[PDB]
Design a protein around this ligand. Sequence first.
Ligand code: HEM
Length: 147
Amino acid sequence: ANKTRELCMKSLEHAKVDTSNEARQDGIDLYKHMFENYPPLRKYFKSREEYTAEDVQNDPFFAKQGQKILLACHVLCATYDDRETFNAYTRELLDRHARDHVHMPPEVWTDFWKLFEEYLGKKTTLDEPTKQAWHEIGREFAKEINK
Ligand code: HEM
C-alpha cells in the first residue's frame, strides 16, 4: 500500500518531470532505452519506426512524449494508495492510446515495467525493497489494464 507508494515515489526523485533540461533529457533517455532495446515496440510509433537511439535523441517529439509518459508513471504511484483513483487512471491511460489507435497486446504493458525498472536502474540504484515495490505496481496495473 503506502510503503509501496513511498518506496516508488522516492526512486522517482531521480527522474524529473519539471521544466528543466534534465527532465527533457530524462524523458528522451527513456525512449532511447526502449528503441535500442525493445525494437518491436518501435512499430507502434507511426513514422519513427526505424529510429535508432540517435534519431530518438534529436527529434523534438520524444522530448514531449517522454514527459507525457514520465508524468504518467509518477501519477500511477502517487495514486496507488487509493485504488479507485489508481484503477480509473489506468483505464484512462488505456483510453488515451485507444483514442489514437495505438492498440497493444496486453503482454506489452507487462513488458513496460521490465523496461521502466531497467531505465530507472541507470538513474539510481534500486534496492530490493524498491524493486519489490515497482513489481507490485506493475502487477496491479497489468491486471487492471487486462479489463
Ligand atoms: C505502461 C506505461 C505506459 C504509460 C504510463 C504510457 C503513457 C502514455 C501517455 C500519457 C500517452 C499520451 C496520450 C495523450 O496524448 O494524451 C501515450 C501515448 C503513446 N504511447 Fe504510451 N504509455 C505507456 C506504454 C506504451 C507502450 C509500451 C507503447 C508501445 C511502444 C506506447 C506507445 C505510445 C504511442 C505510440 C503513443 C501515441 C504518441 C502520439 O501522440 O503520437 N505506450 N502513452
